[PDB]
Scaffold this active site. Sequence first.
Site, PDB file in Angstrom:
ATOM      1  N   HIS D  53      11.653 -19.320  47.024  1.00 11.01           N
ATOM      2  CA  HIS D  53       9.656 -19.528  47.786  1.00 11.01           C
ATOM      3  C   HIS D  53       9.771 -18.738  48.657  1.00 11.01           C
ATOM      4  O   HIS D  53      10.340 -18.952  49.673  1.00 11.01           O
ATOM      5  CB  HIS D  53       9.854 -20.936  48.193  1.00 11.01           C
ATOM      6  CG  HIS D  53       9.459 -22.594  47.315  1.00 11.01           C
ATOM      7  ND1 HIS D  53      10.891 -22.621  46.512  1.00 11.01           N
ATOM      8  CD2 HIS D  53       8.932 -22.655  45.555  1.00 11.01           C
ATOM      9  CE1 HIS D  53      10.384 -23.829  45.703  1.00 11.01           C
ATOM     10  NE2 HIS D  53       9.420 -23.341  44.943  1.00 11.01           N
ATOM     11  N   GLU D 180       5.752 -22.741  35.395  1.00 11.45           N
ATOM     12  CA  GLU D 180       6.780 -23.829  34.823  1.00 11.45           C
ATOM     13  C   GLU D 180       6.108 -24.834  34.701  1.00 11.45           C
ATOM     14  O   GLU D 180       4.947 -25.493  35.436  1.00 11.45           O
ATOM     15  CB  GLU D 180       7.480 -24.071  36.359  1.00 11.45           C
ATOM     16  CG  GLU D 180       8.694 -25.384  35.994  1.00 11.45           C
ATOM     17  CD  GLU D 180       9.983 -25.315  36.612  1.00 11.45           C
ATOM     18  OE1 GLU D 180       9.615 -23.646  38.195  1.00 11.45           O
ATOM     19  OE2 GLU D 180      10.330 -26.315  37.206  1.00 11.45           O
ATOM     20  N   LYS D 182       5.276 -28.920  34.065  1.00 14.53           N
ATOM     21  CA  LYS D 182       5.619 -31.003  34.826  1.00 14.53           C
ATOM     22  C   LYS D 182       4.468 -31.261  34.048  1.00 14.53           C
ATOM     23  O   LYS D 182       3.342 -31.733  34.357  1.00 14.53           O
ATOM     24  CB  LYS D 182       6.089 -30.763  35.610  1.00 14.53           C
ATOM     25  CG  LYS D 182       6.951 -31.709  36.324  1.00 14.53           C
ATOM     26  CD  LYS D 182       7.586 -31.857  38.128  1.00 14.53           C
ATOM     27  CE  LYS D 182       8.576 -33.189  37.958  1.00 14.53           C
ATOM     28  NZ  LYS D 182       7.967 -33.322  39.475  1.00 14.53           N
ATOM     29  N   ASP D 244      15.387 -23.636  33.764  1.00 16.00           N
ATOM     30  CA  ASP D 244      15.645 -24.495  34.731  1.00 16.00           C
ATOM     31  C   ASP D 244      17.009 -25.108  34.325  1.00 16.00           C
ATOM     32  O   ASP D 244      16.390 -25.799  33.617  1.00 16.00           O
ATOM     33  CB  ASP D 244      14.944 -24.913  35.442  1.00 16.00           C
ATOM     34  CG  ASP D 244      14.383 -24.217  36.650  1.00 16.00           C
ATOM     35  OD1 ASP D 244      14.342 -22.851  37.115  1.00 16.00           O
ATOM     36  OD2 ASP D 244      13.084 -24.612  37.812  1.00 16.00           O
TER      37      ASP D 244
HETATM   38 MN   LIG Z   1      12.069 -26.480  38.532  1.00 20.72          MN
HETATM   39 MN   LIG Z   2      12.250 -31.458  38.836  1.00 22.23          MN
END
Ligand SMILES: [Mn+2]
Ligand SMILES: [Mn+2]
Lengths: 386, 386, 386, 386
Positions: D53, D180, D182, D244
Amino acid sequence: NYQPTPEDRFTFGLWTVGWQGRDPFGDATRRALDPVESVRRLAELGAHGVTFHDDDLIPFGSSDSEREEHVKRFRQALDDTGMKVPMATTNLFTHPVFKDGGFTANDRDVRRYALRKTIRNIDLAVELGAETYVAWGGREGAESGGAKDVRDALDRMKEAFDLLGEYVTSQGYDIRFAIEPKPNEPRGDILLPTVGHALAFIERLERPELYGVNPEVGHEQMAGLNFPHGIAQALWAGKLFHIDLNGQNGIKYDQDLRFGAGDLRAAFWLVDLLESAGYSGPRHFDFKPPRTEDFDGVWASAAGCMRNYLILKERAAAFRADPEVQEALRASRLDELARPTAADGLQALLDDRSAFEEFDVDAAAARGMAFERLDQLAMDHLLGAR
Amino acid sequence: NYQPTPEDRFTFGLWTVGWQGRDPFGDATRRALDPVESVRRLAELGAHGVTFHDDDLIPFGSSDSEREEHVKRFRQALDDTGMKVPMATTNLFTHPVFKDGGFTANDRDVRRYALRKTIRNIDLAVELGAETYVAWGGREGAESGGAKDVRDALDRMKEAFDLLGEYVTSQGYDIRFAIEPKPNEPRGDILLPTVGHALAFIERLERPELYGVNPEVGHEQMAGLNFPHGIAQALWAGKLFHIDLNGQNGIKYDQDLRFGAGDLRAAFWLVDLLESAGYSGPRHFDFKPPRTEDFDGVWASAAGCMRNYLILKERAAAFRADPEVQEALRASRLDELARPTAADGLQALLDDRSAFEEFDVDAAAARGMAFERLDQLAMDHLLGAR
Amino acid sequence: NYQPTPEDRFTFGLWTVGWQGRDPFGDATRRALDPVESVRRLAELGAHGVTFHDDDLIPFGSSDSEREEHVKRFRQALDDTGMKVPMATTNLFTHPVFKDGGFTANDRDVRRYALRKTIRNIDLAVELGAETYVAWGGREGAESGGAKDVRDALDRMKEAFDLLGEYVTSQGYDIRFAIEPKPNEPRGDILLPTVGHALAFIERLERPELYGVNPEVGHEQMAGLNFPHGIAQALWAGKLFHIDLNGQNGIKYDQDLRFGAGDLRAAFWLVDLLESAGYSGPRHFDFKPPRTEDFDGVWASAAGCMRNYLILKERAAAFRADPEVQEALRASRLDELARPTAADGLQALLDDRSAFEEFDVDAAAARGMAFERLDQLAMDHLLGAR
Amino acid sequence: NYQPTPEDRFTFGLWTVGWQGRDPFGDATRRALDPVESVRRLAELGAHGVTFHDDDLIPFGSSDSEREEHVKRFRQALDDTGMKVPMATTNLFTHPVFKDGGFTANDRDVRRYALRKTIRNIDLAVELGAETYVAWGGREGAESGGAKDVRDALDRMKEAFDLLGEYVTSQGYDIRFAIEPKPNEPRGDILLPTVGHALAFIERLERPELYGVNPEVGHEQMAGLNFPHGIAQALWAGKLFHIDLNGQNGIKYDQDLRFGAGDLRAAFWLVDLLESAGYSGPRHFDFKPPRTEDFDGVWASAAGCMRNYLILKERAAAFRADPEVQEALRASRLDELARPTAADGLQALLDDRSAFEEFDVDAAAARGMAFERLDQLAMDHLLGAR
Ligand SMILES: [Mn+2]
Ligand SMILES: [Mn+2]
Ligand SMILES: [Mn+2]
Ligand SMILES: [Mn+2]
Ligand SMILES: [Mn+2]
Ligand SMILES: [Mn+2]
Ligand SMILES: [Mn+2]
Ligand SMILES: [Mn+2]
């Protein structure tokens, strides 16, 4: 309009309104609050008292002098406001030394340090008038299977609790212990993960009478369990020494929302049970105002905790006092659940042909329980739609 | 090549290989199996014995004559094969009469019927040589809050267990009881939902020595708990009377997959613990061959249960016997977890300056636990990649 | 007092009030209901219409004659009551032939049979005036990894949906399709397990305009997801063709409780969103009266579904119309979320020093969002405690 | 013996081995690592490259001068070791300014700042040779219902992604985006919570070809979903741009264990699918060495990530190449799942009497799928017990 007073026995941890907002992915969003300020603000909102971990009140590593100064200032704010301190606990989770646990760390030296830090805080708690000392073993557990032999860790956890009981007994203190379960977080799995596991462990201690449980709404919900049911088992055993009230939205990280948030129907049934059973301990809130809020939002969140308890208390009381509900309870045979199955004894049961040989199974099976009507009455009462 | 023999003590319920495949959304995909056939097929695969609920062996509503006939045929198959019957249990969940529970139904008459049906099957179990009688209270619970007062239901559950203990004692039977927890399904929430809650309840019975637990892999996993940890607590308490082995993929409906399926690393740690602790009871499988399979697939699934246990036993034994693992265990201080924290006593601890005043917290905190290296050795042993 | 009328557009599946109570562990507790009787009883309670799977209306294996007779009787009850049939669907899960799926079974012959059974029911649905045809692929999935190559199964699922679209287009029917996701049960994992996965799949079909989603409250909650958030994404995409309303208590088996039970705060936010967005389709209930109830309890449960929706509608409307709430929404900057970030365009954004070089990050970070006050207003409105 | 080389394409985030161990309940247990040191240590273990990052490489608030210095040092370590930087991303979650989100914050000024910070890092990423730019919207979401209108937040998220696409296109960069998902943590619920929701959102962007997904093992498992199934849907759509890899033990906080830990059977099926489909992107590990470990344990944990992938690759390859497995796949009709259902077309299907009128449903239903035998072959191959 649902205004709390000190008589309602509402309490808050210093770490609750004082949470600065640091999470696993972000920095603090609020400055630190002085404990004296929290006491004053809480008293104005109508709370009865506060609670603390050792490290919330006295910064870790404080000299004896600094320690005395922190206590004196705190005792002055209590005197000025009339607030009480009904419970205290120990921080055995923040410092890196506790990375593998306090009472059950694999290193023996760490275990001995954890007990000494605990004992020092028991003396302080007694001085301040606490009646209950909580233990939350947040670092007792593991992320992998080989790291901890659980039988040996339970021997070590028993040994620690037995020594603490010997200490209070020898000193003649009037304090009892309450273990607070949590299933996971920060460890992969935590030992004594639910109210059941903690109740069972207490029965193996040397002086079981000194120990009870401090269940927390959101922790049992992290295991997908029914919180009111777990509290009924703790009351049945005579072990509900204290309680932690908050909110949680299912199985995920420990949210610690304000009480009433999360599962609102479970909050209703919880207040129904505490008030019916005549629980007389503190109504303690272990919550975190979300990191989105400023100070104004902190105090609004704290006030909402108490408001929600008082609205629910009113609704549960109205439910139990309604003649139409009392009738529905009899329709669903709640009165028969409270009668003994066989006060007549085993032999009488064995000789009773109506219990087996001549029991009409089909007639009994056809009887509806009328649970849906009863639950809709409970819904209407909760929503104020009677 | 991982061939089981009767000496490995593998057992199966009649209801396991005999499940016809009816689920909440579908009809049976297999015909019913005669119990005599299951005994013969299981003996050929190398099992030690079978278990049964009353209704698996004797169809509900059977006359005394029909009952005697069913038992005689079953006893003949046992004699012919050398199979044993180490455990039996009662069906208090299928028939509509049990819709609100057996021991804790709100209707008193149903409660008395449940006890009489249970007692009749205890007599049979003793006749067949069972040493353990299991109770799974699958209908004891609720879908809504007002339907069940949990304190009164626990009074009723205690009363039922106390009467059963009085019965076995008066008859001079050599049988013990094991309660099997489950958190939910078929009820919204089931009473005594985990191993912890069942252990705690036993301590309030009149003769606690007669009762233990029968934990099931997939049930504790439906609450997201660590199964090996719960088993270590049951062994610590001296209450692991029997066990149910299977597989489950997380928090969802009770899958009952074959043992080894689901969480394979948890199966490794479970076998490691049972063999290290010297558990000597049956290795019982409560599983359901998936409804996708025909009879050939049923027996393949049953054989895989035993194969997986034997592969895991070999791998766990190789792990514990490897000198490099023994070294890693000392590196992670597992030897220090097994030593008393303070055999010196409380006063000595209080006077020990090395435990607090002169304890170097930073030095202790910097010590790595070396858990990741140990867990990678465990991984390599499991995979046979040493 | 919260009385529904046909204008509220409440609908029920025949399989809902008609569920006999068979579960994975028990027999039916209620007799079967004739579809004509359900239509009459529902009309008296104030419903607008009913829905059905093929097999609910015409018993599997029915001759052409028997089929015509079942339809005629049903059409007469619709005419007599004024009830409508806004949606229909196919049973591709009960019969053993579908044990490995309908559209994605490994056997090619089963796949072709599944499409023919579906097509036959589309013709019937059109005849009865249905506007939406739902597909719930309850058997499309697996219990083990090797059993299903998911890429090939998605090819097969696309092929089936494309053929159905070609059929309706060629016939000139005015019907659209809605896929209903579910994450698991009865299969270990089901394909297209959530609203997101179903939305993504639709974009790969030949004529995407013909397909939308039919989300169900309890299914997204079995994955621990936020139902109102998933519905907002379906509305954003213009794909909310139908909805299934019920209740569920967290991550466990699919409970199908009455609407309002389970997560009551999520039910509030759902009704808030449907009414604000002006959803104009049916308010359909896919629920199961608990097996504890008799027929009286069935109809009480069904009436509670509609009552709860109407109470919540009133409370959400009162929340949005309160001037104090409108003020709190501006305090929390909901008005700014609705404005474009950069209507000025990319270059203007790039050249704007106030967006980066001269942006005061600390001042912006200190601004509280005032979300807790807003959520307490929402709580007070829900509870009728303003 | 399972030694990785740069050719295996293993990559690690700087934030992974560099995690100091701060959790919601504790302080850091390790000192910070210089990025140059991590590059050197990773290269010695056999990794191919690293990712970062913005804030991992250049401390937040750095002057232009300090920035240039940090980059130069990093580029020197890359040149010295041969390591590559295949992916970069932005930190829009740590600083307090992002407490309500970056792209979807209610404050418009914060949204504009988030886009400018992102653009600055895209330029850097291109300079370093990255091919993929990931976006993880960890603060995009809410803890309460009224705080965020999800339709307006999706408008804002689309607007941000469209502007980023316009930027890369105008600059002529050869970089693609990967979102990504989540489901929760740190927010109560996060927007685009799964791979399905992210795939669906991409189809509404202005230039969908520029965007794909970066799924993470543990995130889909926090929703109880099957990770290999979600990856098969992403490959089917042609959107698996990056991945990932890590481990997670069920539905709880995001653990980020090393790859192979957690659900070991799901790791097997994942490697089977990536290698069979010929995925050619980086094998990236987003993990955290547990806070119990020192530096030695950090590097052991990182090495175990790569070892576990190589053992699983060997086992999956042996499974697919075994003639006995190839035979079992045909026995379970995996070859028939890959054939079109109706290449003959709709009319031919409609006219085919063998598909309905003369289809023998009972014969097809009796056919076992032989899935249990196939899954036991997969188990034996995984364990090296063939
Ligand atoms: Mn990740
Ligand atoms: Mn994670
Ligand atoms: Mn908590
Ligand atoms: Mn607490
Ligand atoms: Mn089970
Ligand atoms: Mn069992
Ligand atoms: Mn459902
Ligand atoms: Mn549905």
